[PDB]
Structures are given as structure tokens and as C-alpha cells.
Amino acid sequence: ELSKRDRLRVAWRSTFIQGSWNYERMQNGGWAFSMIPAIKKLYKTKEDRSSALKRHLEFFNTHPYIASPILGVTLALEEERANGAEVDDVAIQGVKVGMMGPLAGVGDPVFWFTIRPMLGALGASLALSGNILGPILFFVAWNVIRWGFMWYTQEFGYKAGSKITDDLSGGLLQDITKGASILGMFVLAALVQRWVNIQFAPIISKVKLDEGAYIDWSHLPQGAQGIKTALQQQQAGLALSEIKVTTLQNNLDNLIPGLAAVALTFLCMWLLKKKISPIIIILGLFVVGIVGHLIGLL
């Protein structure tokens, strides 16, 4: 009858949602593993155990932490369809598929790119000083918030589907989606600019400066005075070397820093929109990088 200390086991096994991760079917075996006690308690005599395994081994890929709402809704439907003979075997899958995209889109930025970076930076602040409290706080706080989120969301999904119709488009449960989307877009743009190294290394021109730009390091005073003259002239703005080496990187940086990064990100987005598997794209990045360094573009 789905006692509480069965949901305890289900939630604890939800910690192992991954581990059986596969390109063919993502997070299906892990999802089946997290549902084993629910099958154990509710079914009997083996005719419909195999049906449960078949209905709990299909495609299910979402954020590992925000997946307990699904793991609660499945019990909410299952505990009442068996006791009442209201078997659907397609609504239990329809509710799974319906909450795939939005939940992943509200969980991936918030956890991977919002809480992970801030907690890692805060922990490494003390860690870079040699203080263990940094990593200790990182571990404790992250695990506490993760377990609390999984528990509370799983109990909220344990509520029947009569409430999920209002608990899917708020209100408050839809505004959080928009806020998370905005914050994720901001942080993702920052990450795309800052941490995608596409530093080119060609050379465009090697022009010698006119006799009004370089410090002319051939007539400076000798000893403690030429030093001062050179420092003041550099602070004025005189070019250090007689040849102004110019690179394609400098020319590209004059429009926006990291233009190549955003261009590559857009290209990868367009490739992904063509149903191309990300593995092929990653291999493409490796091969284009290696051939570019071979040619000399990068």
C-alpha cells in the first residue's frame, strides 16, 4: 500500500538514477533500479513483474536531481490503478514524456551551471587558502540541498494527478521556469565567452613603425636614467618594439571578444538541430582542432 519507508528506499535508490547510462537508451536501467521496491511491494506472483520491467525500461533521460517528481507521480498513479483496476499503461508513459523537456531545462542550468559554479568558487575560496572548511562546506551544503530537493519534490509528486494539472502551469511553478531560463541564458553566455579557447595564431602583417612611435632604444641615458626615460615613455604610450606584430586574434577581438566561441557554439547548435549525435560532433571538434593546428590556423 506504498508505506512511507518504501518511499524512503525509492528515494535513496534514486541516488543511483545514473550508472546504467547508455547512448541507445539513457538512464533507463537506473530508472528501473530506482523503482524495484515499488514493484516488489505492489505486485505478486510474477505475471506482471515482467510487464513492470518492460514499462520501466524505456527511454527516460532527464536531470538526475530533478527526476523525483516523476518518481513520485509514477507511484501516485500506480498505487491507485492497481487498487481499482484503472490500468492505463500509456498515461503512465504520457506523464513521463510530458515532464521530460521542461524539467531538464529548469534543472540543468540551475544545478550544473548556477549552484555548482557558485558553490565551487565559494569552496575554493577557502581551499585556495589551505582551509578545509571550504571543501567541507561545499560537500555538506551541496548534499543537503540535493537530498532535500529530491525528498520534497518526490513527496510533491506523490500527490495525485488531480493536482499536477495546476502544478504544471502556474501560478508559481511556471514563473520559476522563466526565471531559471533567464539566469541560465545569462550564465551560459558568460561561460561561452570566457571558457571556450579558440585562440587563433596567424600573423597578418609585420610593419616597422615610423620614427615617432618606438622609444628608440639606442640613445637612452646609461645608468638609472634611461630606465626612467623608458618607463615614462612607455607610460606615455610609445610602442615597445620597432615592428608592430599584428595577429588575426587582435583583429577579431576588436569587434567582440570571443567571436569564434559564439560562432562555434551556434554552429554546434545548428548541427544538433539536425539530429546529429553529440558524439560525432565532439569527434568533429577534435579533428577540426588537430587539422587546424596542423595547417596553422589555430
Partner: peptide, 17 residues
């Protein structure tokens, strides 16, 4: 230099998400 570029794909999906 390719290892510093693969993360873009990781963003490319979520930005697409």
C-alpha cells in the same frame, strides 16, 4: 586545443534546450 572546445557542445545542447 580540442579539449578546450568540446565544452561548447555541452553548452550548445542546453542553450538549445
Amino acid at each position: 586545443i580540442g579539449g578546450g572546445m568540446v565544452v561548447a557542445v555541452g553548452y550548445a545542447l542546453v542553450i538549445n534546450m
